[PDB]
Design a protein around this nucleic acid. Structure first.
Ligand SMILES: [Zn+2]
Lengths: 11, 233, 92, 665
DNA sequence: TTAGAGAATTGGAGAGTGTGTTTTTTTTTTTTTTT
DNA sequence: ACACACTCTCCAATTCTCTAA
């Protein structure tokens, strides 16, 4: 499955 | 030196000085552009006085303020029933008696957006009544669609009020009853006038469409009309 | 089929409407002065290039015009032939 | 099946009561817990449920069951804390073995449940399903363990260690040494558990703290206070410092590396040195806020949003455009900008690192973490005593391990080593920059030849295999070594070390490195810049130089510099000083003027120099305006001497032999 | 070192589908029948 | 039937990779 983290999330 | 922001101007002085004899006509025919030009002239002149005469006053304070011209004594007064569709967007002068005033209405001027995921924020300018919402969040690493959202109580607003003006009995036709017209007024002039007051005004005579229903963009063929005042006496 | 997309291409640049206009006029268009600030003169240079870019190909934002130009500028041999022709004219 | 699943859950629940319970004779409202029987078998079978079943089936279901029945919070902590407090009172006075057996086996489960979590394309679909939820439950674990009696379970774990400190190494059996590994393996987890990372399946393009958890429960600030009261820092300090004397180095010194990584991570050193104060700086910040407000006001119309007229602008060749709004009537700069801003398209865009916990490598570190005063001074004391006591002896051991084991490494151990080196060397340099009581000799093990080879070899191997995260960390470590060298040269063998550091092979590598940076994330390019600044400055003070500098100057380096410079709204005051230092080097000294006559530089200087961007009084404007003045003077001269450059300014320079030489000069 | 041939990833054009719409006072001026 | 909101689908524009001169 194409699992992916929100690597860019840093607020 | 009094710390104040508005300048009166009776238009006859434009006819006395030779270089502005034609500007007088252009004012009546193109008020929205000409008045804006006058505003940005006055503010620059105020800055020039303190920097040329090298005075102690804070330049930042003067840069922060808004300055506005208010023209008056423009010409002959016009009968309320005799305004015609060839007068739209020209300057007008009216005499009458005040019936009632609605309470102050908040009018939006700047919108405030915040990103739901990364908490980036943007302030946006309102013109022509339409909010120019961004397509995607503008932070480089968070370039995502539908990602921004509006925050109502962090926007910026301004005061609007509507005044109901009635025809003076001196002009009414034989065997008839007086009519009335509605005036839109903003900022400084908002709470100036009470029921039973007798006044003379100056403002652009405007017209706008109205919708057939609140669901769709369908407009009616008849247009609403009103006056947008810039001075009261 | 759907309508094919419209793009910037070297043919537009090599057209008479294109790049020759800049070389025909740039000497007369821009003017620097020591009598005005860096920011002043710097702003001045971009005016002509912006209006010319709009007149050439109004699709896109100015930056995108420059960065688009890089690709075709590096790749197309005919455009490069024209450019070496310019610098040969100065070698003449 | 679901029923087999719930049968195991029920089996676990029954085991979650066979364990024991408090006493309802007690009239002590409440008493502590009280002990069951078969409980050895109970603990052992739970251990089997993890190892013999869940691991063999790769599930995490068993952990979900124990979390359902709250085993950690409910039994394990009071069993341990009662053992500890009983033995504490007995020590105050100054079958019992069975009690101690229970103490050991409860701790081993605490290590197992709080062990940190890894997800790959080889993890089971079961684990991938359960990842997000078990994260929540481990967050609960961290909060609880730090909270009970103000954290008193942590005294039990070190008392267990103290039994095995006790008697001579010459006696200490392999089973015995596992306790001393186990205890330290516990504290690593308690520091490592932190708020979740959101993850989803990329099928369609469209917080995780549970209701009982908050940030102040979970912050690194809390962990400092908790360890200090419960007497941990003395244990890590004594244990690391006497490490050279015959504690078998092999069992301790990697776990003991991971601790130091796991709470140096997320500190900027400047936050530990100061360089009503809070209120004063807050007031100053409000002045900055007022300036931003002023900037918005300068673009705001006086009269309302429906008063607005209409504007027409006529070009050469008598063609006309239309724009709306009242400020456009007077400001052509705004009208020109507003005209282009309406247009819809943007070109779509391209994008380096995964598999490891948040750190300097993939986060913007211009964002501190925040300390009580007692915490600030206690943390400063801990790492200061660590540096003055432990650092050389630790690095010497861990490095002369890894030279014998480099082939077998895994990505994490590489990224740990390179970000433990970096932190401590930098912090010491800063501390002795500040004050004379500190000295540089304390960190001097980094320079000796073996470690220099090893950092080099890591960077080499990482670059060749195109592993970009290790390459990034190795870049950071190799930066600091060079920085430390310039310090020591400003005071014998160090020149020998330089000459070996700047063999031709390495110059090929260190020259190569900024060129590829253009594609990658904003930190990568920043690492490249700072390393380049240091690398050239050392070789300037070597006195070769002209060969080396010409090696650096070409189009693909300049491309990186501009691509980085245009994101200046996000960057520091200091980094822009570094970029313009380099442009001064390219433009004035080397006299390679032809590189910078390219249009997207000319746009940039307007944005940044305008009333838009860089502040009217920041030190940056001194450098920028002093640069642009000279730029435009030389550009004027060039354009009038040879008018072909008007069409030159759009494009890259032209690499033909016969015309190109005259073109560049 | 350039460039050109082949493969993979993404955008949005535009075609399609389903949907919603017409439509008991309480206070105040005036006429009328009732005591 | 007439503006809208929302879903689905195909096709080509784009960038990335490999090979040889
Ligand atoms: Zn965002």
């Amino acid at each position: 499955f194409k699992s992916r983290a929100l690597n860019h999330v840093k607020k | 030196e009094l710390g104040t922001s508005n300048l009166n101007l009776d238009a006859r002085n434009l006819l006395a000085y030779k270089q502005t004899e034609d500007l007088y006509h252009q004012l009546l025919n193109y008020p929205q552009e000409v008045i804006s030009i006058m505003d940005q002239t006055i503010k620059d002149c105020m800055v020039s006085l303190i920097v040329d005469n090298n005075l102690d006053y804070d330049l930042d304070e003067i840069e922060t303020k808004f300055y506005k011209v208010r023209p008056y004594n423009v010409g002959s007064c016009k009968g309320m029933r005799e305004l015609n569709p060839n007068d739209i967007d020209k300057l007008i002068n009216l005499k009458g008696l005040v019936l009632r005033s609605t309470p102050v209405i908040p009018d939006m001027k700047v919108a405030f957006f915040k990103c739901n995921v990364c908490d980036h924020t943007m302030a946006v300018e309102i013109d022509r009544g339409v909010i120019q919402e961004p397509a995607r969040c503008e932070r480089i690493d968070c370039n995502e669609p539908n990602s921004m959202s509006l925050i109502h109580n962090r926007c910026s607003f301004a005061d609007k009020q509507v005044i109901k003006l009635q025809e003076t009995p001196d002009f009414v036709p034989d065997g008839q009853t007086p009519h009335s017209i509605s005036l839109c007024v903003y900022d400084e002039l908002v709470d100036s006038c009470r029921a039973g007051d007798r006044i003379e005004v100056t403002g652009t005579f405007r017209s706008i469409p109205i919708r057939a229903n609140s669901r769709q963009r369908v407009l009616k063929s008849l247009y609403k009309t009103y006056v947008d005042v810039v001075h009261v006496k | 089929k759907r309508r094919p997309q419209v793009k910037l291409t070297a043919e537009k640049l090599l057209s008479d409407k294109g790049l020759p206009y800049v070389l025909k006029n740039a000497h007369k268009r821009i003017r620097i002065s020591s009598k005005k600030n860096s920011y002043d003169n710097l702003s001045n240079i971009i005016q002509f290039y912006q209006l010319w870019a709009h007149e050439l190909f109004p699709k896109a934002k100015f930056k995108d015009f420059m960065k688009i130009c890089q690709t075709v500028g590096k790749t197309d041999p005919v455009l490069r032939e024209y450019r070496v022709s310019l610098f040969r004219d100065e070698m003449g | 099946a679901d029923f087999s699943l719930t049968v195991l859950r029920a089996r676990i629940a029954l085991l979650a009561t066979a364990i024991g319970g408090p006493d309802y004779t007690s009239q002590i409202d409440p008493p502590p817990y009280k002990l069951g029987d078969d409980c050895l078998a109970c603990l052992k079978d739970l251990k089997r449920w993890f190892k013999l079943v869940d691991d063999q089936q790769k599930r995490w279901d068993v952990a979900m069951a124990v979390a359902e029945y709250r085993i950690l919070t409910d039994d394990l902590l009071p069993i341990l804390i009662d053992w500890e407090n009983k033995c504490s009172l007995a020590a105050k006075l100054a079958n019992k073995a069975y009690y101690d057996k229970i103490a050991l086996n409860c701790l081993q489960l605490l290590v197992l449940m709080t062990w940190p979590l890894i997800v790959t394309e080889q993890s089971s679909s079961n684990q991938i399903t359960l990842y997000g939820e078990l994260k929540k439950h481990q967050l609960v674990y961290k909060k609880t363990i730090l909270s009970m009696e103000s954290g008193k379970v942590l005294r039990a774990a070190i008392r267990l260690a103290l039994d095995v400190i006790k008697i001579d190494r010459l006696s200490r059996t392999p089973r015995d040494n596992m306790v001393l590994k186990l205890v330290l393996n516990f504290f690593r987890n308690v520091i490592a558990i932190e708020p979740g990372e959101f993850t989803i399946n990329t099928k369609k393009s469209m917080d995780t703290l549970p209701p009982n958890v908050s940030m102040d429960d979970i912050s690194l600030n809390t962990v400092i206070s908790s360890f200090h009261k419960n007497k941990v820092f003395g244990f890590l300090l004594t244990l690391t410092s006497s490490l050279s004397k015959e504690f078998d180095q092999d069992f301790i010194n990697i776990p003991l590396l991971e601790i130091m990584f796991y709470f140096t991570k997320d500190v900027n050193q400047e936050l530990l040195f100061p360089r009503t104060s809070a209120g004063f700086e807050l007031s100053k910040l409000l002045q900055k806020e007022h300036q931003m407000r002023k900037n918005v006001i300068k673009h705001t119309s006086a009269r309302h949003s429906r008063f607005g007229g209409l504007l027409s602008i006529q070009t050469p060749d008598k063609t006309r455009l239309t724009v709306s709004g009242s400020q456009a009537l007077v400001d052509e700069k705004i009208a020109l900008q507003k005209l282009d801003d309406s247009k819809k398209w943007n070109k779509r865009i391209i994008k380096a690192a995964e598999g490891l916990p948040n750190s300097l490598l993939n986060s913007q570190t211009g964002k501190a973490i925040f300390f009580t005063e007692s915490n600030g001074k206690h943390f400063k004391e801990f790492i200061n005593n660590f540096i003055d006591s432990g650092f050389n002896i630790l690095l010497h051991s861990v490095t002369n391990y890894f030279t014998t084991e480099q082939d077998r490494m895994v990505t994490l151990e590489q990224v740990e080593y390179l970000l433990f080196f970096a932190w401590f060397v930098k912090y010491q340099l800063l501390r002795s920059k500040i004050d004379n009581s500190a000295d540089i000799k304390q960190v001097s093990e980094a320079l000796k030849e073996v470690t220099f080879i090893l950092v080099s070899s890591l960077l080499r191997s990482a670059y060749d295999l195109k592993n970009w995260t290790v390459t990034h960390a190795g870049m950071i470590a190799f930066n600091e070594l060079l920085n430390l060298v310039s310090r020591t040269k400003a005071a014998t063998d160090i020149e020998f070390i330089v000459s070996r550091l700047f063999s031709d092979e390495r110059i090929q590598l260190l020259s190569n490195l900024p060129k590829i940076g253009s594609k990658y994330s904003l930190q990568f390019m920043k690492s490249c810049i700072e390393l380049t600044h240091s690398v050239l400055k050392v070789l300037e003070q070597y006195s070769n130089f002209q060969k080396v500098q010409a090696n650096y100057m070409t189009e693909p380096v300049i491309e990186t510099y501009i691509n980085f410079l245009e994101r200046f709204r996000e960057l520091e005051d200091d980094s822009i000083k570094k970029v313009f230092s380099f442009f001064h080097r390219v433009f004035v000294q080397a006299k390679e003027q032809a590189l910078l006559f390219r249009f997207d530089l000319i746009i940039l200087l307007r944005e940044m120099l305008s009333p838009d961007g860089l502040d009217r009084m920041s030190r940056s404007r001194k450098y920028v305006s002093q640069f642009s003045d000279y730029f435009l003077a030389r550009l004027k001269k060039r354009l009038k001497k040879s008018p072909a450059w008007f069409v030159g300014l759009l494009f890259p320079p032209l690499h033909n032999s016969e015309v190109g030489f005259y073109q560049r000069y």
